[PDB]
Write a protein that binds this ligand. Structure first.
Ligand SMILES: Nc1ccn([C@@H]2O[C@H](COP(=O)(O)OP(=O)(O)O)[C@@H](O)[C@H]2O)c(=O)n1
Ligand SMILES: Nc1ccn([C@@H]2O[C@H](COP(=O)(O)OP(=O)(O)O)[C@@H](O)[C@H]2O)c(=O)n1
Ligand code: NA
Ligand code: NA
Lengths: 137, 137
């Protein structure tokens, strides 16, 4: 058999607090836990890559639309990854809205810990993510 | 930036002594040394994979035809790899004739040591090879 791996460097960047909002919603929390087998920290780590990232080149899991506290929320595409910081690894996932006007060089990742606090990460620090497999594996 | 890796399991198999012949020829010995930066053991380790291997999907190096002791020999396609046996790694390369009637599930690898003796490998033992990059990287 064979295994394909891709390791991508990403530069830590900041959003405007969107992910701490969305990741506070129980339907997203609960579905991420079911898919990924961990309870995500409430937030997303934004990473700036040097090429656009297209989740459709991989075997992602898609979640469903839902309504919560009266507002409509849309499903997301989720791709399990490993996060590599120095010699440590952390289970995580790339999360992308299910509909986007184009693929971005900015990705958002979820993990079971606050990565900035655990690893003292500041904007500009570079870390790596590892993806196993692709859409044809 | 990103790095792509592919790790493929191969089962140790035997040829009929072809590679010890070809790898004894000084033009092949010398060109492999120049390309790869190691002096190959005189022989090739044959490995049986569970899918066909196509060297043309990777960034291989092609050698030139030559004449030696009066006979014509043809250039080969060479792809640097790591050989993984347990927790050890060895620099090596996949070598394929430059013209073949089709891609095979059997590959031949060269290395700077006799792998069978160094690692006590018998027909049927399984090892791994690692390839970094592909034709578009
Ligand atoms: N697993 C995570 C998730 C978010 N974060 C960080 O936690 C904070 C809150 O997440 P957020 O989704 O609101 O991100 P920003 O839009 O604030 O960059 C930000 O500083 C993220 O970079 C983290 O360090 N580890
Ligand atoms: N780097 C290498 C090259 C060949 N070999 C083995 O060395 C012997 C001689 O190589 P060969 O190219 O004549 O292969 P066969 O056709 O004998 O299988 C064979 O037993 C190969 O499996 C090795 O263990 N390590
Ligand atoms: Na975020
Ligand atoms: Na051989």
């Amino acid at each position: 058999s064979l295994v394909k791996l891709m390791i991508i460097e990403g530069e830590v960047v900041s959003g405007l607090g969107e992910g701490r909002y969305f990741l506070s919603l129980p339907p997203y929390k609960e579905i991420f836990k079911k898919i990924l087998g961990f309870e995500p920290y409430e937030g997303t780590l934004n990473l700036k890559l040097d090429r656009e990232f297209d989740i459709n080149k991989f075997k992602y899991i898609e979640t469903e639309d839902f309504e919560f506290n009266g507002k409509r929320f849309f499903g997301v595409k989720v791709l399990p990854i490993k996060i590599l910081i120095g010699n440590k690894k952390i289970d995580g996932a790339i999360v992308v809205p299910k509909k986007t006007y184009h693929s971005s060089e900015i990705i958002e990742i979820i993990a079971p810990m606050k990565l900035r606090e655990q690893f003292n990460l500041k904007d500009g620090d570079v870390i790596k993510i590892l993806i196993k497999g692709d859409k044809d594996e």
